[PDB]
Ligand binder design. Structure first.
Ligand SMILES: *[C@@H]1O[C@H](CO)[C@@H](O)[C@H](O)[C@H]1NC(C)=O
Lengths: 445, 99, 50
């Protein structure tokens, strides 16, 4: 059996194209195969996407894999919803309930909000880019009203290439006048690397500053330069290199050839290319399951042109989208389980922090168990509680009248109690008052 | 569909309305196929050739009237249908002028 | 100095050689720390500028 699908790739998607071919070879089975039929296009142009869709509809495809942008998300979901052709994508999740579209990227807005109440911020800044939609900005602005925040939102995306350095430096000086110590960065990997370089040059990576990089790829960008500075950096990642299934893949990924597979000989993989590798597994698992329940999707009749008046559906496409949503496998991202609409549910996002040793892990995020810390830290033994012994004699140490209600140091009062408070302030320690058990000042038998 | 059917008819210019969902379809087709489009809808953010906007802008008029009434704290209620370009103007001006 | 964050305001540096502008100087320029130095070659002079 040979199942024929379609592919839509942007210009310059070199690492995602390589991980697509690697997923073809490993997830190949002797029972059936997949035919790619790969095309290349400009993703921002709605004219080029329209020609690419109606071309592959004429040849006749069972499913289409591709990327989209904000400028062409409406062209995809309208064609796929009308002409009943399924669409699997690693791009940003759409807003609403669009049929026939499978989102392979997990949502981020719930994880980003929960991290902010953990650090307990009341006032911060938010730098955004308009490329992935404004769904993350609308989430934090609506949530700021009910939970009493003060958010400064600045658009950084439309900066021209020739005048970058004047505009970024004028931006942080305006933040300096407001004394904004807390910055959230919502940008792609290339735009974050440009902002981080402008942070260091004007001297904004010193102790006292905090940064949150709001994307699924934390360690994909350059991170060594802000590491030794002194400012805390937090972030998110969905790919766990400590997992055995991922670590087995990285060993095969590093040993590949550069001249055949460009971008292969590295130690890391992007989160975009990881979801491209997982999507080949989901498509293969569906047609393997579809043949197993003996469902025929053969279409001997010609499709015709896409611009058909009236537009007619084909009822085998309803069967295919139900098969794609009923796929549960294990991948690089983790457990892949879908709801009715096609958005990923039952997933985990790893909250990370930057240290001088390197990036670490401090917990995870799930939609059932909101934020769970990982108890790998033992601290507090460095601080000492000094044991202060005393005797009960008036007016030196006396018991207060409500000693039953109070506990510990609050129970006692007197001259020596005030003296103990003064010495601990000048010396710099903490104490716990204990009455001597014998009740005597001191002698030697 | 309606753009290409009239393009087969051989029309000189096209008069129509667009929404936020179909703003990207119109400006891309008319830019490539070099046909003029005259519209009373909201102006596009940025510059696009072969599109004639009949509606004037409003972002300068709001920032004058707010400054004239001398406001420092207010609430902004918006609908998403004409884009978010008006909200981006009053958020960038708020940081500069302490609102 | 820059990587560990020691070019901020409050610091001063004197580079004790006859060539001050021969080295790279743009990176500590916008930081905030004062830098002093020495030079014997005057580019404003007409004999040097020729
Ligand atoms: C997701 O569901 C599967 C069973 O369908 C379960 O084994 C797994 O533990 C779930 N994920 C999490 C994070 O609990």
């Amino acid at each position: 059996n040979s199942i024929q699908i379609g592919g839509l790739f942007p210009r310059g998607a070199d690492q995602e194209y390589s991980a697509f071919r690697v997923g073809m070879v490993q997830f190949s089975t002797s029972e059936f195969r997949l035919t790619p039929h790969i095309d290349n296009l400009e993703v921002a142009n709605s004219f080029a996407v329209t020609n690419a869709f109606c071309s592959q509809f004429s040849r006749g495809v069972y499913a289409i894999f591709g990327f989209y942008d904000k400028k062409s998300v409406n062209t995809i979901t309208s064609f796929c919803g009308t002409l009943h052709v399924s669409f699997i994508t690693p791009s940003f999740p759409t807003d609403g309930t669009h049929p026939f579209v499978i989102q392979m990227r997990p949502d981020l807005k719930g994880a980003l909000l929960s991290l902010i109440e953990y650090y307990q911020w009341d006032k911060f800044a938010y730098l955004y880019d308009s490329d992935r939609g404004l769904s993350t900005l609308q989430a934090v602005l609506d949530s700021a009203a009910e939970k009493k925040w003060q958010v400064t939102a600045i658009n950084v995306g439309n900066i021209n290439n020739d005048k970058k350095d004047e505009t970024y430096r004028s931006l942080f000086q305006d933040l300096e006048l407001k004394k904004e110590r807390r910055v959230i960065l919502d940008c792609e990997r290339d735009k974050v690397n440009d902002i981080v370089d402008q942070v260091i040059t004007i001297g904004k990576h010193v102790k006292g500053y905090h940064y949150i990089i709001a994307n699924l790829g934390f360690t994909d960008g350059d991170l060594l330069k802000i590491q030794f500075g002194g400012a805390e950096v937090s972030g998110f990642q969905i790919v766990d290199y400590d997992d055995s299934l991922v670590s087995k893949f990285i060993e095969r990924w590093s040993t590949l050839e550069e001249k055949e597979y460009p971008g292969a000989h590295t130690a890391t993989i992007k989160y975009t290319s990881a979801l491209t590798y997982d999507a080949v597994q989901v498509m293969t698992e569906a047609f393997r399951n579809l043949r197993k329940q003996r469902i025929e999707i053969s279409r001997r009749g010609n499709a015709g042109d896409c611009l058909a008046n009236p537009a007619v559906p084909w009822g085998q496409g309803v069967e295919i989208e139900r098969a794609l949503k009923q796929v549960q496998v294990e991948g690089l991202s983790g457990n892949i389980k879908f709801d009715q609409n096609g958005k990923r549910i039952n997933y985990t996002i790893n909250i990370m922090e930057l240290k001088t040793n390197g990036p670490r892990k401090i917990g995870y995020w799930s939609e059932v168990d909101k934020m769970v810390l990982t108890e790998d830290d033992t601290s507090g033994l460095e601080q000492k509680t000094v044991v202060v012994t005393t005797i009960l004699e008036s007016p030196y140490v006396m018991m207060k009248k409500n000693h039953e209600m109070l506990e510990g140091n609050e129970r006692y009062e007197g001259y020596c109690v005030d003296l103990a408070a003064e010495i601990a302030k000048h010396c710099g320690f903490k104490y716990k008052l204990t009455i001597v058990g014998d009740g005597k000042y001191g002698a030697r038998d």
